[PDB]
């Protein structure tokens, strides 16, 4: 009883702070920066994906407390589509920004040719199309099921039922956890190893603290991404492998893991936009 009110307040606070941070980043990008550099297009893409992903939380919150979905099948399709779609959009946006900083630091001659707003816009369009490749069939597959006492907003099964659902869960697990952490970790590790050799940072005491600041920013971004996206995917793998007995503690673990997963979508505008030096120059 108290736990349900607790998790409901948790979803409400996370949704409010995520929408507030996303609207602040939209306000600064629209009225102040006016989209001059290529990086601001990626920050706009991340803010849009995080705002649309965080918008799914009031529809998801009532599902636990009420137990029914009294909104119709079409809105169920839209909510499941947005939920998968903006998740993939944000994850590939973070991967594209990691590749952007890798090309910017490690390959300086080709970064003059590649890092243009035209390539940023076409890779942004390719990002939304590649996320729509997962968003549209899940949108078509989303259905509404009538239980004996409840309404369920869920995915339908084609025969064999275990194969398609477990293949979808393993494919989302791999393409959202294994590949992106590997790309971000390798590109940022090679970036830190390349910046360690640079004379502009590896000299006097004054530039050493700037190098430490950059390494700290890299470690904070990678650590927040890993600590946020690990537990809900690990819990999905644990349920896929072994059936878990129903407990009061696991019911709170569900909403705590979902809150942790959305917390990254909340915190990526704070970690990226505000912490950047150019946005501090705007102040």
């Amino acid at each position: 009883m108290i736990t349900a009110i607790t998790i409901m307040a948790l979803y409400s606070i996370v949704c409010v702070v995520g929408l507030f941070g996303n609207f602040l980043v939209m306000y600064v990008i629209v009225r102040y920066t006016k989209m001059k550099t290529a990086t601001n297009i990626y920050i706009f893409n991340l803010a849009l994906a995080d705002a649309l992903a965080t918008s799914t939380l009031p529809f998801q919150s009532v599902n636990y407390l009420m137990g029914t979905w009294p909104f119709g099948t079409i809105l169920c399709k839209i909510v499941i589509s947005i939920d998968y779609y903006n998740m993939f959009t944000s994850i590939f946006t973070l991967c594209t920004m990691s590749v952007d900083r890798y090309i910017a630091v490690c390959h300086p001659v080709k970064a003059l040719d590649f890092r243009t707003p035209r390539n940023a816009k076409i890779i942004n369009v390719c990002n939304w199309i590649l996320s729509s490749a997962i968003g549209l069939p899940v949108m078509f597959m989303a259905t509404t099921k009538y239980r004996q006492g409840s309404i369920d907003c869920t995915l339908t099964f084609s025969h064999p039922t275990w194969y398609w659902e477990n293949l979808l869960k393993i494919c989302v697990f791999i393409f959202a956890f294994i590949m992106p952490v590997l790309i971000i970790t390798v590109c940022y590790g090679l970036m830190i190893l390349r910046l360690k050799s640079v004379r502009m940072l590896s000299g006097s005491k004054e530039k050493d603290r700037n190098l430490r600041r950059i390494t700290r920013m890299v470690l904070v971004v990678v650590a927040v991404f890993i600590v946020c996206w690990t537990p809900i995917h690990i819990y999905v793998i644990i349920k896929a492998l072994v059936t878990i007995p129903e407990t009061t503690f696991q019911t709170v673990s569900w909403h705590f893991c979902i809150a942790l997963g959305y917390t990254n979508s909340c915190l990526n505008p704070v970690l990226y936009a505000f912490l950047d030096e150019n946005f501090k120059r705007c102040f």
Binding site: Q60, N63, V79, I80, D83, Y84, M87, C153, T154, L155, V172, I232, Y235, V236, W254, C257, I258, G261
Partner: peptide
């Protein structure tokens, strides 16, 4: 993710 995790819900529904």
């Amino acid at each position: 993710y995790x819900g529904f």
